[PDB]
XYZ file of C-alpha atoms in Angstrom:
330
model
C 82.948 111.574 105.097
C 86.035 113.181 103.584
C 89.790 113.241 104.141
C 92.557 115.693 103.241
C 96.305 115.154 103.638
C 99.382 117.047 102.507
C 101.836 115.241 100.244
C 105.490 116.318 100.292
C 108.364 115.689 97.851
C 111.035 113.347 99.286
C 113.886 115.350 97.773
C 114.764 118.458 95.751
C 113.953 116.719 92.446
C 110.412 115.574 93.303
C 111.574 111.953 92.868
C 108.487 110.825 94.796
C 105.949 112.188 97.306
C 105.189 111.009 100.853
C 101.929 111.387 102.715
C 101.503 110.675 106.462
C 99.211 107.737 107.308
C 97.988 106.662 110.761
C 98.013 102.873 111.374
C 96.806 101.023 114.461
C 95.785 101.883 118.003
C 97.447 103.956 119.383
C 98.284 105.504 116.020
C 101.604 104.681 114.413
C 102.324 107.328 111.761
C 104.208 106.161 108.658
C 105.057 108.196 105.551
C 103.728 106.324 102.536
C 104.072 106.741 98.787
C 100.531 107.034 97.412
C 100.607 105.051 94.180
C 97.748 105.146 91.660
C 99.686 102.501 89.674
C 99.436 99.666 92.245
C 96.961 98.223 94.736
C 98.819 97.034 97.853
C 99.181 98.969 101.107
C 102.468 97.651 102.483
C 104.814 98.856 105.209
C 108.249 98.429 106.707
C 107.617 96.622 110.001
C 108.955 94.852 113.064
C 109.021 91.716 110.872
C 111.264 93.191 108.166
C 114.707 91.530 107.944
C 116.862 93.770 110.143
C 119.645 94.207 107.573
C 117.051 95.557 105.091
C 115.880 98.420 107.327
C 117.994 101.597 107.172
C 116.228 104.601 108.702
C 112.597 103.895 107.873
C 109.811 104.129 110.414
C 108.328 100.686 111.126
C 104.863 99.412 111.928
C 104.863 97.105 114.963
C 101.603 95.174 114.994
C 102.172 93.696 118.459
C 101.857 97.255 119.835
C 98.468 97.876 118.168
C 95.391 96.741 120.091
C 93.335 96.680 116.867
C 95.816 94.619 114.791
C 94.768 91.082 113.836
C 96.879 88.614 111.855
C 95.075 87.678 108.655
C 95.692 83.955 108.996
C 97.468 82.286 106.113
C 97.730 85.420 103.983
C 100.908 86.387 102.169
C 101.817 88.977 99.567
C 104.563 89.547 97.044
C 104.915 92.377 94.544
C 107.316 93.540 91.835
C 107.272 97.034 90.354
C 108.056 98.427 86.916
C 111.384 99.768 88.191
C 112.626 96.305 89.203
C 112.053 96.685 92.929
C 110.089 94.231 95.073
C 108.821 93.339 98.558
C 106.897 90.528 100.271
C 105.562 89.407 103.637
C 102.448 88.616 105.670
C 99.216 90.501 106.398
C 97.345 92.118 109.265
C 94.073 93.966 109.374
C 94.072 97.223 111.341
C 92.624 100.733 111.481
C 94.084 103.120 108.898
C 93.407 106.866 108.673
C 94.437 109.418 106.046
C 93.903 113.100 106.694
C 90.956 112.462 109.016
C 89.287 109.679 106.982
C 89.270 106.317 108.795
C 88.920 102.751 107.502
C 88.595 99.857 109.949
C 89.701 96.361 108.941
C 92.110 97.602 106.267
C 94.621 95.049 104.999
C 98.078 96.234 106.085
C 100.749 94.180 104.358
C 103.794 93.754 106.592
C 107.133 93.382 104.828
C 109.371 90.477 105.770
C 111.651 91.255 102.797
C 112.295 94.387 100.703
C 114.658 94.891 97.773
C 117.671 97.160 97.871
C 116.117 100.313 96.413
C 113.548 100.377 99.228
C 116.198 99.847 101.912
C 118.304 102.610 100.364
C 115.461 105.148 100.513
C 115.071 106.132 104.173
C 112.206 108.564 103.434
C 109.579 106.037 102.223
C 108.057 103.772 104.914
C 105.855 101.895 102.441
C 103.283 102.275 99.660
C 99.527 102.944 99.646
C 98.027 101.624 96.422
C 95.203 103.520 94.716
C 94.789 101.556 91.461
C 91.957 99.018 91.180
C 91.747 96.236 93.752
C 91.939 93.587 91.018
C 95.726 94.169 91.083
C 96.085 93.461 94.823
C 98.647 90.680 95.433
C 97.377 89.147 98.694
C 96.921 85.365 98.522
C 94.831 83.291 98.898
C 92.193 85.983 99.545
C 92.687 89.197 97.545
C 92.256 92.403 99.576
C 90.728 95.832 98.845
C 92.547 99.163 98.579
C 92.050 101.931 101.119
C 89.955 103.898 98.566
C 87.822 100.864 97.768
C 87.137 100.288 101.487
C 86.346 103.999 102.073
C 84.287 104.691 98.951
C 80.779 103.926 100.196
C 81.310 106.245 103.178
C 82.639 109.190 101.150
C 80.470 112.213 100.284
C 81.382 111.581 96.624
C 83.231 108.458 95.396
C 86.371 110.309 94.289
C 89.882 111.189 95.303
C 92.018 114.004 93.862
C 95.766 114.434 93.353
C 97.237 117.935 93.441
C 100.998 117.416 93.368
C 103.327 120.374 93.752
C 106.388 121.335 91.739
C 109.261 121.525 94.210
C 106.567 122.129 96.852
C 103.955 120.308 98.920
C 100.532 119.430 97.542
C 97.357 117.623 98.548
C 95.453 114.335 98.317
C 91.716 114.763 98.984
C 89.173 111.952 99.453
C 85.454 112.393 98.977
C 85.247 115.937 97.570
C 86.495 118.276 94.849
C 88.083 121.493 96.116
C 86.831 124.037 93.583
C 89.400 126.589 94.790
C 92.339 124.339 93.848
C 92.169 124.735 90.050
C 91.477 127.283 87.313
C 88.887 127.022 84.552
C 86.871 123.819 84.340
C 87.663 120.127 84.865
C 87.663 118.082 81.632
C 86.636 114.479 82.152
C 87.832 111.615 79.976
C 87.031 107.877 79.752
C 88.894 105.171 81.702
C 89.517 101.499 80.949
C 89.924 99.330 84.041
C 90.771 96.178 82.026
C 94.434 96.184 83.171
C 93.612 97.363 86.698
C 94.988 100.868 86.098
C 93.563 104.380 85.650
C 94.066 103.980 81.890
C 92.919 106.755 79.526
C 93.654 108.241 76.073
C 95.285 111.620 75.585
C 94.204 113.493 72.423
C 97.688 114.692 71.465
C 100.632 116.930 72.247
C 102.631 120.064 71.519
C 106.285 120.976 72.099
C 106.876 124.517 73.335
C 105.028 127.073 71.218
C 104.623 124.533 68.422
C 101.401 123.461 66.773
C 99.288 120.812 68.468
C 99.513 117.313 66.978
C 96.211 115.457 67.225
C 96.967 111.813 67.958
C 95.657 109.227 70.443
C 98.060 108.262 73.244
C 96.835 105.479 75.568
C 98.452 105.595 79.014
C 98.063 105.383 82.785
C 97.771 108.113 85.377
C 100.419 106.913 87.844
C 101.361 108.978 90.903
C 103.924 106.299 91.822
C 106.086 106.877 88.744
C 108.355 109.930 88.723
C 108.682 110.680 85.011
C 106.532 110.984 81.864
C 106.991 107.946 79.595
C 105.627 108.362 76.057
C 106.124 106.799 72.591
C 109.592 107.186 71.069
C 108.240 109.379 68.232
C 106.816 111.911 70.716
C 109.905 111.882 72.918
C 112.234 112.392 69.944
C 110.158 115.370 68.777
C 110.483 116.939 72.229
C 114.235 116.470 72.704
C 114.983 117.602 69.127
C 114.107 121.113 70.344
C 116.908 121.075 72.955
C 120.430 121.719 71.632
C 122.777 118.911 72.578
C 120.113 116.524 73.890
C 120.641 112.858 73.140
C 119.571 109.363 74.134
C 122.321 107.664 76.149
C 122.279 103.864 76.418
C 124.893 104.007 79.206
C 122.835 106.406 81.312
C 119.493 104.800 80.423
C 117.616 107.566 78.629
C 117.640 111.093 77.253
C 120.151 113.490 78.730
C 120.668 117.170 77.958
C 123.154 119.930 78.745
C 122.472 121.305 82.213
C 122.929 124.780 80.674
C 119.746 124.417 78.559
C 116.435 126.167 78.965
C 113.817 123.485 78.345
C 110.659 124.035 76.283
C 107.219 123.241 77.721
C 105.257 120.123 76.805
C 101.497 120.194 76.290
C 99.209 117.152 76.441
C 95.582 116.933 75.359
C 92.616 115.928 77.506
C 89.654 115.957 75.182
C 89.556 119.428 73.673
C 91.434 120.819 76.700
C 95.183 121.269 77.127
C 97.562 120.803 80.085
C 100.892 122.638 79.875
C 103.951 121.162 81.629
C 106.473 123.993 82.061
C 109.985 123.264 80.839
C 111.484 123.453 84.336
C 109.347 120.448 85.403
C 111.269 118.318 82.872
C 114.734 118.927 84.468
C 115.895 116.093 86.784
C 119.382 117.411 87.358
C 122.895 116.055 86.949
C 123.210 112.360 86.044
C 125.895 112.035 88.734
C 127.043 114.559 91.309
C 128.909 117.442 89.652
C 128.123 116.427 86.079
C 127.063 118.963 83.470
C 124.856 116.306 81.799
C 121.308 116.455 83.136
C 118.613 113.747 83.061
C 115.380 114.393 81.204
C 111.906 114.133 82.671
C 110.293 112.907 79.445
C 111.534 109.450 78.435
C 110.591 106.729 75.970
C 108.066 104.061 76.972
C 109.411 101.692 74.324
C 109.933 98.344 76.028
C 107.768 99.206 79.069
C 104.699 98.103 77.157
C 102.586 101.030 78.350
C 102.732 104.836 78.341
C 102.908 106.367 81.819
C 101.614 109.801 82.816
C 103.721 110.005 85.961
C 104.411 112.860 88.357
C 106.006 115.116 85.701
C 102.636 115.263 83.924
C 100.277 114.956 86.870
C 101.883 117.772 88.888
C 100.966 120.247 86.103
C 97.297 119.475 86.767
C 94.568 119.077 89.307
C 93.550 115.430 88.768
C 90.240 113.792 89.700
C 90.177 110.016 90.112
C 86.448 109.389 89.801
C 85.457 106.020 91.273
C 81.790 106.166 90.308
C 80.168 102.986 88.924
C 81.823 103.831 85.598
C 85.182 105.348 86.567
C 86.525 108.437 84.760
C 89.496 110.797 85.063
C 89.328 114.588 85.258
C 92.054 117.152 84.546
C 92.125 120.904 85.175
C 94.864 123.503 84.891
C 95.919 125.161 88.151
Protein backbone atom coordinates (compact mmCIF):
# COMPACT_ATOMS: atom_id res chain seq x y z
CA UNK A 1 0.00 0.00 0.00
CA UNK A 2 0.85 3.69 -0.19
CA UNK A 3 -0.56 7.02 0.98
CA UNK A 4 -0.17 10.62 -0.19
CA UNK A 5 -1.46 13.74 1.56
CA UNK A 6 -0.95 17.46 1.05
CA UNK A 7 0.55 19.45 3.91
CA UNK A 8 -0.27 23.16 4.18
CA UNK A 9 1.39 26.00 6.12
CA UNK A 10 -0.78 27.28 9.01
CA UNK A 11 0.15 30.90 8.37
CA UNK A 12 2.12 33.25 6.09
CA UNK A 13 5.40 32.50 7.90
CA UNK A 14 5.31 28.69 7.60
CA UNK A 15 5.23 28.48 11.42
CA UNK A 16 4.00 24.89 11.11
CA UNK A 17 2.25 22.61 8.60
CA UNK A 18 -1.09 20.80 8.90
CA UNK A 19 -2.12 17.62 7.14
CA UNK A 20 -5.70 16.25 7.11
CA UNK A 21 -6.18 12.91 8.90
CA UNK A 22 -9.32 10.73 8.97
CA UNK A 23 -10.16 9.23 12.40
CA UNK A 24 -13.00 6.85 13.24
CA UNK A 25 -16.14 5.56 11.57
CA UNK A 26 -17.73 7.57 10.03
CA UNK A 27 -14.56 9.56 9.38
CA UNK A 28 -13.83 12.57 11.53
CA UNK A 29 -11.25 14.72 9.72
CA UNK A 30 -8.76 16.60 11.91
CA UNK A 31 -5.81 18.72 10.78
CA UNK A 32 -2.69 17.40 12.49
CA UNK A 33 0.89 18.59 12.77
CA UNK A 34 3.07 15.75 11.46
CA UNK A 35 6.06 15.70 13.79
CA UNK A 36 9.18 13.63 13.08
CA UNK A 37 10.48 14.79 16.49
CA UNK A 38 7.86 13.01 18.65
CA UNK A 39 5.92 9.74 18.76
CA UNK A 40 2.39 10.39 20.06
CA UNK A 41 -0.73 10.81 17.92
CA UNK A 42 -2.91 13.04 20.08
CA UNK A 43 -6.03 15.09 19.39
CA UNK A 44 -8.31 17.76 20.76
CA UNK A 45 -11.47 15.88 21.73
CA UNK A 46 -14.87 15.84 23.39
CA UNK A 47 -12.97 15.16 26.64
CA UNK A 48 -10.77 18.26 26.45
CA UNK A 49 -11.46 20.81 29.22
CA UNK A 50 -13.95 23.18 27.58
CA UNK A 51 -12.08 26.37 28.52
CA UNK A 52 -8.98 24.99 26.73
CA UNK A 53 -10.69 24.56 23.34
CA UNK A 54 -10.82 27.70 21.16
CA UNK A 55 -11.70 26.92 17.54
CA UNK A 56 -10.09 23.52 17.05
CA UNK A 57 -11.90 20.59 15.49
CA UNK A 58 -12.47 17.82 18.06
CA UNK A 59 -12.52 14.05 17.91
CA UNK A 60 -15.62 12.60 19.60
CA UNK A 61 -15.01 8.92 20.25
CA UNK A 62 -18.61 8.22 21.31
CA UNK A 63 -19.64 8.99 17.70
CA UNK A 64 -17.19 6.47 16.19
CA UNK A 65 -18.41 2.88 15.89
CA UNK A 66 -14.81 1.61 15.69
CA UNK A 67 -13.51 3.50 18.77
CA UNK A 68 -12.57 1.41 21.82
CA UNK A 69 -11.30 2.79 25.13
CA UNK A 70 -7.83 1.42 25.83
CA UNK A 71 -8.55 0.53 29.45
CA UNK A 72 -6.28 2.07 32.03
CA UNK A 73 -4.07 3.89 29.53
CA UNK A 74 -2.98 7.48 30.01
CA UNK A 75 -0.50 9.78 28.31
CA UNK A 76 1.35 12.97 29.11
CA UNK A 77 3.88 14.82 26.98
CA UNK A 78 6.02 17.96 27.13
CA UNK A 79 7.70 19.50 24.10
CA UNK A 80 10.94 21.40 23.59
CA UNK A 81 9.02 24.67 23.32
CA UNK A 82 7.52 24.31 26.81
CA UNK A 83 4.06 23.22 25.72
CA UNK A 84 2.28 20.11 26.99
CA UNK A 85 -0.87 17.95 26.86
CA UNK A 86 -2.26 14.83 28.54
CA UNK A 87 -5.29 12.55 28.62
CA UNK A 88 -6.59 9.04 27.97
CA UNK A 89 -6.42 6.67 24.99
CA UNK A 90 -8.66 5.02 22.43
CA UNK A 91 -7.89 2.71 19.56
CA UNK A 92 -9.58 3.55 16.26
CA UNK A 93 -9.15 3.52 12.48
CA UNK A 94 -6.83 6.23 11.16
CA UNK A 95 -6.21 7.05 7.49
CA UNK A 96 -3.73 9.44 5.87
CA UNK A 97 -4.00 10.21 2.18
CA UNK A 98 -5.61 6.85 1.40
CA UNK A 99 -3.43 4.69 3.69
CA UNK A 100 -5.40 3.07 6.53
CA UNK A 101 -4.30 1.67 9.90
CA UNK A 102 -6.79 -0.17 12.11
CA UNK A 103 -6.29 -0.28 15.88
CA UNK A 104 -4.18 2.89 15.96
CA UNK A 105 -3.70 4.46 19.38
CA UNK A 106 -5.48 7.83 19.34
CA UNK A 107 -4.56 9.82 22.42
CA UNK A 108 -7.46 12.00 23.55
CA UNK A 109 -6.55 15.23 25.32
CA UNK A 110 -8.18 16.00 28.65
CA UNK A 111 -5.77 18.93 29.16
CA UNK A 112 -3.69 21.08 26.79
CA UNK A 113 -1.36 23.98 27.58
CA UNK A 114 -2.01 27.54 26.51
CA UNK A 115 -0.03 27.59 23.27
CA UNK A 116 -2.16 24.74 21.90
CA UNK A 117 -5.41 26.43 22.92
CA UNK A 118 -4.22 29.67 21.33
CA UNK A 119 -3.54 28.00 17.96
CA UNK A 120 -6.93 27.31 16.38
CA UNK A 121 -5.39 25.76 13.24
CA UNK A 122 -3.77 22.67 14.84
CA UNK A 123 -6.17 19.92 16.01
CA UNK A 124 -3.38 17.70 17.34
CA UNK A 125 -0.06 16.04 16.50
CA UNK A 126 0.87 12.89 14.57
CA UNK A 127 4.26 11.65 15.74
CA UNK A 128 6.70 10.12 13.25
CA UNK A 129 9.82 9.64 15.40
CA UNK A 130 10.59 6.18 16.80
CA UNK A 131 7.96 4.46 18.92
CA UNK A 132 10.40 4.17 21.84
CA UNK A 133 9.49 7.81 22.62
CA UNK A 134 5.73 7.16 22.85
CA UNK A 135 4.36 8.33 26.23
CA UNK A 136 1.39 5.98 26.73
CA UNK A 137 1.42 4.19 30.10
CA UNK A 138 1.40 1.44 31.23
CA UNK A 139 1.57 -0.07 27.73
CA UNK A 140 3.60 1.96 25.21
CA UNK A 141 1.94 2.37 21.80
CA UNK A 142 3.23 2.40 18.20
CA UNK A 143 3.28 5.35 15.79
CA UNK A 144 1.11 5.44 12.68
CA UNK A 145 4.21 4.76 10.50
CA UNK A 146 5.28 1.85 12.68
CA UNK A 147 1.79 0.29 12.44
CA UNK A 148 1.65 0.85 8.64
CA UNK A 149 5.20 -0.17 7.74
CA UNK A 150 4.76 -3.87 7.04
CA UNK A 151 1.90 -3.10 4.64
CA UNK A 152 3.75 -0.41 2.68
CA UNK A 153 5.29 -1.08 -0.75
CA UNK A 154 8.59 0.21 0.68
CA UNK A 155 9.14 0.97 4.40
CA UNK A 156 9.61 4.72 3.94
CA UNK A 157 7.87 8.04 4.21
CA UNK A 158 8.95 11.30 2.56
CA UNK A 159 8.60 14.96 3.54
CA UNK A 160 8.40 17.59 0.80
CA UNK A 161 7.56 20.82 2.60
CA UNK A 162 6.84 23.96 0.62
CA UNK A 163 8.15 27.49 1.09
CA UNK A 164 5.09 29.69 1.56
CA UNK A 165 3.19 26.96 -0.32
CA UNK A 166 1.68 23.51 0.15
CA UNK A 167 3.75 20.34 -0.03
CA UNK A 168 3.40 16.60 0.38
CA UNK A 169 3.85 13.69 2.80
CA UNK A 170 4.10 10.33 1.00
CA UNK A 171 4.05 6.88 2.65
CA UNK A 172 5.41 3.76 1.01
CA UNK A 173 7.05 5.16 -2.14
CA UNK A 174 9.56 7.69 -3.47
CA UNK A 175 8.17 10.09 -6.08
CA UNK A 176 11.08 10.39 -8.50
CA UNK A 177 9.48 13.44 -10.14
CA UNK A 178 9.56 15.45 -6.90
CA UNK A 179 13.31 16.17 -6.77
CA UNK A 180 16.30 17.02 -8.97
CA UNK A 181 19.56 15.11 -9.23
CA UNK A 182 20.03 12.12 -6.94
CA UNK A 183 19.09 11.36 -3.32
CA UNK A 184 22.10 11.23 -0.95
CA UNK A 185 21.60 8.85 1.95
CA UNK A 186 23.24 9.29 5.33
CA UNK A 187 23.40 7.21 8.55
CA UNK A 188 20.90 7.52 11.42
CA UNK A 189 21.25 6.86 15.14
CA UNK A 190 18.01 5.83 16.84
CA UNK A 191 19.56 5.81 20.35
CA UNK A 192 17.60 8.92 21.45
CA UNK A 193 14.44 7.93 19.56
CA UNK A 194 14.94 10.60 16.88
CA UNK A 195 15.93 10.70 13.20
CA UNK A 196 19.44 11.73 14.30
CA UNK A 197 22.18 12.18 11.67
CA UNK A 198 25.46 14.07 11.06
CA UNK A 199 25.77 16.90 8.57
CA UNK A 200 29.21 17.23 6.92
CA UNK A 201 29.41 21.02 7.17
CA UNK A 202 28.11 24.38 6.01
CA UNK A 203 28.56 27.50 3.91
CA UNK A 204 27.20 31.04 4.26
CA UNK A 205 26.10 32.66 1.00
CA UNK A 206 28.75 32.34 -1.70
CA UNK A 207 31.39 31.57 0.92
CA UNK A 208 33.67 28.56 1.03
CA UNK A 209 32.34 25.33 2.50
CA UNK A 210 33.51 24.52 6.03
CA UNK A 211 33.92 20.78 6.56
CA UNK A 212 32.79 19.97 10.09
CA UNK A 213 30.52 17.34 11.67
CA UNK A 214 27.18 18.62 12.99
CA UNK A 215 25.03 16.02 14.80
CA UNK A 216 21.31 16.87 14.75
CA UNK A 217 17.73 15.71 14.26
CA UNK A 218 15.46 15.97 11.25
CA UNK A 219 12.37 17.45 12.93
CA UNK A 220 9.32 18.48 10.90
CA UNK A 221 7.66 19.63 14.14
CA UNK A 222 10.18 22.40 14.81
CA UNK A 223 9.87 25.61 12.78
CA UNK A 224 13.44 26.90 12.74
CA UNK A 225 17.02 25.67 12.17
CA UNK A 226 18.91 25.39 15.47
CA UNK A 227 22.69 24.99 15.13
CA UNK A 228 25.84 25.52 17.25
CA UNK A 229 26.53 29.11 18.33
CA UNK A 230 29.74 29.24 16.24
CA UNK A 231 27.83 28.42 13.04
CA UNK A 232 24.97 30.78 13.82
CA UNK A 233 27.35 33.66 14.59
CA UNK A 234 29.16 33.11 11.28
CA UNK A 235 25.84 33.33 9.44
CA UNK A 236 24.47 36.47 11.11
CA UNK A 237 27.84 38.26 10.85
CA UNK A 238 27.10 38.53 7.12
CA UNK A 239 23.91 40.56 7.75
CA UNK A 240 24.41 44.25 8.57
CA UNK A 241 22.77 45.15 11.85
CA UNK A 242 21.96 41.59 12.94
CA UNK A 243 22.32 40.85 16.63
CA UNK A 244 21.38 38.39 19.35
CA UNK A 245 18.67 39.86 21.58
CA UNK A 246 18.17 38.36 25.05
CA UNK A 247 14.87 40.25 25.42
CA UNK A 248 13.46 38.86 22.17
CA UNK A 249 15.00 35.40 22.63
CA UNK A 250 17.36 35.08 19.67
CA UNK A 251 18.92 36.68 16.62
CA UNK A 252 17.05 39.56 15.06
CA UNK A 253 17.92 41.55 11.94
CA UNK A 254 16.76 44.69 10.14
CA UNK A 255 13.64 43.91 8.13
CA UNK A 256 15.26 45.92 5.29
CA UNK A 257 18.03 43.30 4.83
CA UNK A 258 18.52 40.87 1.99
CA UNK A 259 19.55 37.61 3.65
CA UNK A 260 22.32 35.35 2.34
CA UNK A 261 21.68 31.65 1.67
CA UNK A 262 22.82 28.89 4.00
CA UNK A 263 24.20 25.60 2.70
CA UNK A 264 24.39 22.36 4.69
CA UNK A 265 26.27 19.19 3.79
CA UNK A 266 24.81 15.71 3.37
CA UNK A 267 27.75 13.48 2.65
CA UNK A 268 29.47 14.98 -0.38
CA UNK A 269 26.18 16.62 -1.45
CA UNK A 270 24.93 20.11 -0.62
CA UNK A 271 21.47 21.52 0.21
CA UNK A 272 21.02 25.27 -0.30
CA UNK A 273 18.51 27.16 1.88
CA UNK A 274 17.69 30.42 0.08
CA UNK A 275 18.01 33.57 2.15
CA UNK A 276 14.28 34.33 1.99
CA UNK A 277 13.55 31.06 3.87
CA UNK A 278 15.42 32.50 6.88
CA UNK A 279 13.10 35.57 7.30
CA UNK A 280 10.40 35.12 9.99
CA UNK A 281 9.12 38.67 9.90
CA UNK A 282 8.61 41.43 12.44
CA UNK A 283 9.17 40.51 16.10
CA UNK A 284 5.91 42.31 16.95
CA UNK A 285 3.31 43.80 14.64
CA UNK A 286 4.68 46.88 12.86
CA UNK A 287 8.26 46.48 14.05
CA UNK A 288 11.20 46.97 11.71
CA UNK A 289 13.16 44.29 13.65
CA UNK A 290 12.70 40.87 12.07
CA UNK A 291 13.23 37.43 13.65
CA UNK A 292 15.82 35.09 12.20
CA UNK A 293 15.19 31.56 11.01
CA UNK A 294 18.62 30.26 12.05
CA UNK A 295 19.08 30.29 15.83
CA UNK A 296 21.52 28.90 18.38
CA UNK A 297 20.96 25.42 19.83
CA UNK A 298 23.06 26.27 22.87
CA UNK A 299 21.06 25.17 25.91
CA UNK A 300 18.67 22.94 23.91
CA UNK A 301 21.17 20.11 24.14
CA UNK A 302 20.70 19.05 20.52
CA UNK A 303 20.92 20.60 17.05
CA UNK A 304 17.60 20.66 15.18
CA UNK A 305 17.16 20.58 11.41
CA UNK A 306 13.63 21.96 11.49
CA UNK A 307 11.33 23.19 8.74
CA UNK A 308 13.69 25.99 7.60
CA UNK A 309 16.20 23.33 6.55
CA UNK A 310 13.88 20.50 5.58
CA UNK A 311 11.73 22.62 3.24
CA UNK A 312 14.80 23.25 1.03
CA UNK A 313 14.96 19.50 0.37
CA UNK A 314 13.11 16.39 -0.59
CA UNK A 315 13.63 14.21 2.51
CA UNK A 316 13.39 10.41 2.74
CA UNK A 317 12.76 8.87 6.15
CA UNK A 318 13.89 5.31 5.48
CA UNK A 319 12.47 2.87 8.03
CA UNK A 320 14.27 -0.22 6.76
CA UNK A 321 15.78 -2.61 9.34
CA UNK A 322 18.68 -0.15 9.62
CA UNK A 323 17.05 3.28 9.25
CA UNK A 324 18.70 6.00 7.12
CA UNK A 325 17.87 9.51 5.93
CA UNK A 326 17.96 10.74 2.33
CA UNK A 327 18.19 14.30 1.01
CA UNK A 328 17.81 15.65 -2.53
CA UNK A 329 17.61 19.15 -3.93
CA UNK A 330 14.31 20.10 -5.58
